[PDB]
Amino acid sequence: SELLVNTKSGKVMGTRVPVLSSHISAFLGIPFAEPPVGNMRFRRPEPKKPWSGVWNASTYPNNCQQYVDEQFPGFSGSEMWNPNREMSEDCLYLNIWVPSPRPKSTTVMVWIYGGGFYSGSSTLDVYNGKYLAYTEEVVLVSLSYRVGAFGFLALHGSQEAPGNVGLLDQRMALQWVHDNIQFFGGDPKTVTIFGESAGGASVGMHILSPGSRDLFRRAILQSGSPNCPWASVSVAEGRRRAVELGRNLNCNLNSDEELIHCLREKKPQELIDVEWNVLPFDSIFRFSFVPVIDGEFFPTSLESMLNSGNFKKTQILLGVNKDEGSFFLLYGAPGFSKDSESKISREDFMSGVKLSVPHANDLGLDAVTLQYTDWMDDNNGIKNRDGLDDIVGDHNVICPLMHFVNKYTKFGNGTYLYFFNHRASNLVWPEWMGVIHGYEIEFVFGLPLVKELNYTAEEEALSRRIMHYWATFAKTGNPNEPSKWPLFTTKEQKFIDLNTEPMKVHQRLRVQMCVFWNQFLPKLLNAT
Amino acid sequence: SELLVNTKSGKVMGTRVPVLSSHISAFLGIPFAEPPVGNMRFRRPEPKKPWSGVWNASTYPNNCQQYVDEQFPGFSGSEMWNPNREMSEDCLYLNIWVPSPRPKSTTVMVWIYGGGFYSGSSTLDVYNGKYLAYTEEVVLVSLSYRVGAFGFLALHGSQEAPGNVGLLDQRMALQWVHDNIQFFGGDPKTVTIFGESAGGASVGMHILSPGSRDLFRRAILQSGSPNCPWASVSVAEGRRRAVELGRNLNCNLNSDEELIHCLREKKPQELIDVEWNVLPFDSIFRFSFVPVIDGEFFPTSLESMLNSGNFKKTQILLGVNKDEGSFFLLYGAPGFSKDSESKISREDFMSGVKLSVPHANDLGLDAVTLQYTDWMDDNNGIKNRDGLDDIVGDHNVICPLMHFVNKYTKFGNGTYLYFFNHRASNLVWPEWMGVIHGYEIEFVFGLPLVKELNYTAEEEALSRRIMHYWATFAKTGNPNEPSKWPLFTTKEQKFIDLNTEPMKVHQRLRVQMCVFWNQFLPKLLNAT
Ligand SMILES: O=c1ccc2c([nH]1)CCC[C@@H]2NCCCCCCCCCCNc1c2c(nc3ccccc13)CCCC2
Ligand SMILES: O=c1ccc2c([nH]1)CCC[C@@H]2NCCCCCCCCCCNc1c2c(nc3ccccc13)CCCC2
Ligand SMILES: *[C@@H]1O[C@H](CO)[C@@H](O)[C@H](O)[C@H]1NC(C)=O
Ligand SMILES: *[C@@H]1O[C@H](CO)[C@@H](O)[C@H](O)[C@H]1NC(C)=O
Ligand SMILES: *[C@@H]1O[C@H](CO)[C@@H](O)[C@H](O)[C@H]1NC(C)=O
Ligand SMILES: *[C@@H]1O[C@H](CO)[C@@H](O)[C@H](O)[C@H]1NC(C)=O
């Protein structure tokens, strides 16, 4: 039995699944920690106690408790990101697809979902690992981690809610993979972590954090990086937001112990109903409970670690999509709709910029406005919409990433940078939204290989080229087999487009805007 | 006798001069003030006292004492701007060209020379009025005014050295036209003042200043406006620079009366030798002794007079040249030369920005750099050369002028704006300098009409259309006889190119950059 595997914590029984005219083994819902319920809510995870008997790993697990998006109910485009199982605090499980026949000690890839640290699930259709596992002969793992207040409530100095527990969830699944993946045909010495949005930030946080470094080999970051402005907060802002969650729910605030005790008595969705209330500003692309810069998981500030080379030195493959900003504008900024072209007045432009840079003084806002307005044609709806689209994507994803890539490449052992700009032929979102945050994932996970999902043949070919770059990179530290994706170097700053056309190599991704965002604006905000 | 005219201060005898194979009358070297010599150095001008007999006005006067440029000795391109007569403090004279036969009561144009308030002459070949006078049938006057410390040494509170006496020279020459021009066939109700660079700034200071307003009808400003960053200083900075002039010359600094007395015993060129020493910073396009905002010639700050409409309401015609900055970079910035393409390293670009905006803090300098650098291609010597060129132009001439024209047009009675971008066929400066500060003047004064100067036919036609637009505007407030130069309006902000090609109307001259210079950079420098 291929399907019956003994792990360090007990036996597990998977299920044989179909993929593209063949089959593979899937092991769904394997527990890697004790359920973090009751008194364990907000605590570091504990390893799962060994169980007797056979764990039924034939079906997907619960998803962690999270804010459910109801903006477009029944709309496929938004529903595909929402949980597709029952939500429960009992949600620390992982999932594994193993090629049939079982390999000997093959390359392992562990997927870390995004969703702004406030949402996500391991079980979504677009994260189905069976296509990538099959086509590339890797052992594919998806983990899960607490999100929202559950994962990231931070009262620094309490051991009861220390912060960063969702990251430590991640770290325990990786520890689990290190310990057990050899029984499924993986090499624990050849594991790649990869993920998107807060998942890509997560990946980079494990590159940084000393307790996480030795649990993987190399890394892929899609549309996220550790240093994103939404991806972390100071101990003092986490403490303020935690206390404010308390005040929103009429908690006793006299000490950490009484606050924590009161928050532990509330049902999950009571916390989620006030979660957004703790944000200190009106905004877009900001999340309430995120990683905290604590001196433990992160021993010093991210920038100082990045300048000093205090981070895992290995190979990384990362990149961005063309219009990262668009869905955040749709969901939170005035003048945008999924049923129109979303031409934006000048008034709505200016309000969108305040939302996008909520921490900027007036001089700050003026700077952004200035950098992104065509003053010959400032009442042009299309230019205002697209200029605000670039603000949001440059500020939140692209420029944070180009900073990370430049800092990392100084010490690293090799960097491959992409720019994903294919708009899929079957997209249900409107044209104006372009190449959307998250929409490279379907290609990574091989979904265009499924004829019933109505992708073009050229899209199947692109997904295959992407899968092979990613799996090759995972296996060898180099996405190219022995036409060529070059190494990004400090000197030449090369990157490739990723679309259906023949591969073009460019240099200096978004340098002009990235200088503004990485060098001038911070300098101005620090001076004023 | 057409040549013998009796004026309010005595009789004058002019001379018949050949022009384009006809003739006209010239009255050269007419005194309009007492010689501002000895104990009148630094004081307000006084009116010329009447003379007996007949003043011989057959030859040009002396030029005012000034720093003579010796950077390119005998090179025609720089010597055309230097004094071509003896320098003397006894320099307050004016020149008049009258059509023959004498007209009855025709349009007058009075020219005010530039040269940064530290130089210039009424007598240059390029300012010879006979072509414009003859072709357009106008009475053409050129005045003179003290420059440098002789005209702008300001010790506010003293009546011996109040500041702005060069402006009052100009104004006395205007009062003399108002009183005497009817005798030469001009109408004093129909006078236009025009000037270039500091001349143009001059013209606009007369529009602003209550004491000058009633001595002209309308105005033409060429590459200068009153609010230029070099065109004025506070009474504090004026005082500081006058004291420093004293210190550079070992003067008793114990009182105004003692400092002034010492500066009056110095020979003129000893002031001139240390003139540049008093500037606060290393700079380009900055000049030591300039108009002061005194509370008398200018009752309040230029900006509040402009905002409140406290100025003469009339018709204006004004404009700028394509490459105003270029000769300033040649004379004073690193990597520039008249004999090469002046491809500028990034280091010489940076050191050029600091000279170009000598007041800026580091944040300021950063902003400028960022606005004018292509970060894809930052070591491109040509893009750096041209970027710095535009900096110098935009900051010192174009954006000050575009501020002025927008504030003026809210109250004025008609504005016409031009962008002169014709590089002359027979230019002696290199191509990199483009369309140079001062090089429209030859068109305006009709020099291309002289075959021996070896302009093309099309440059001849251009000079004729230009003279005709200026003289038609002088005559009627509208450059067009009713292809049409449209009015500049607050809404549509139209202007035309002036070159050898058919008219193009465009909108919003240099708005993208003028937004940075007039709105953002000043907020940035105000916070920090
Ligand atoms: O960004 C916002 C928007 C609105 C608001 C705020 N912030 C805070 C202040 C209050 C305001 N409204 C409060 C409720 C917030 C609504 C929550 C946003 C829902 C986002 C849905 C996440 N889904 C994903 C989508 C896409 N890509 C994703 C990729 C990463 C995983 C999640 C994704 C592409 C298109 C549509 C959806
Ligand atoms: O602008 C500068 C340049 C250099 C320097 C400073 N400032 C201050 C710091 C010290 C430095 N060097 C000190 C010597 C100063 C020399 C002054 C420059 C001479 C310019 C001569 C005026 N000539 C004119 C020219 C032109 N146009 C003019 C139109 C306006 C009237 C004068 C003009 C076009 C081309 C060449 C010349
Ligand atoms: C395992 O669990 C699921 C769902 O709760 C069930 O439907 C399935 O048939 C079970 N199978 C075995 C072999 O235990
Ligand atoms: C990775 O490190 C090894 C030696 O430690 C070296 O040979 C190789 O060149 C490095 N590669 C890159 C791209 O840094
Ligand atoms: C794609 O195409 C087919 C046939 O043209 C259709 O029946 C099916 O509904 C479409 N697939 C999806 C899931 O959109
Ligand atoms: C006036 O001066 C000029 C030139 O120096 C000359 O040709 C003419 O003789 C003079 N006229 C009289 C009356 O002196």
Ligand SMILES: *[C@@H]1O[C@H](CO)[C@@H](O)[C@H](O)[C@H]1NC(C)=O
């Ligand atoms: C100039 O003023 C007159 C009346 O004083 C007016 O009717 C005319 O339109 C004005 N023109 C402009 C361009 O303001």
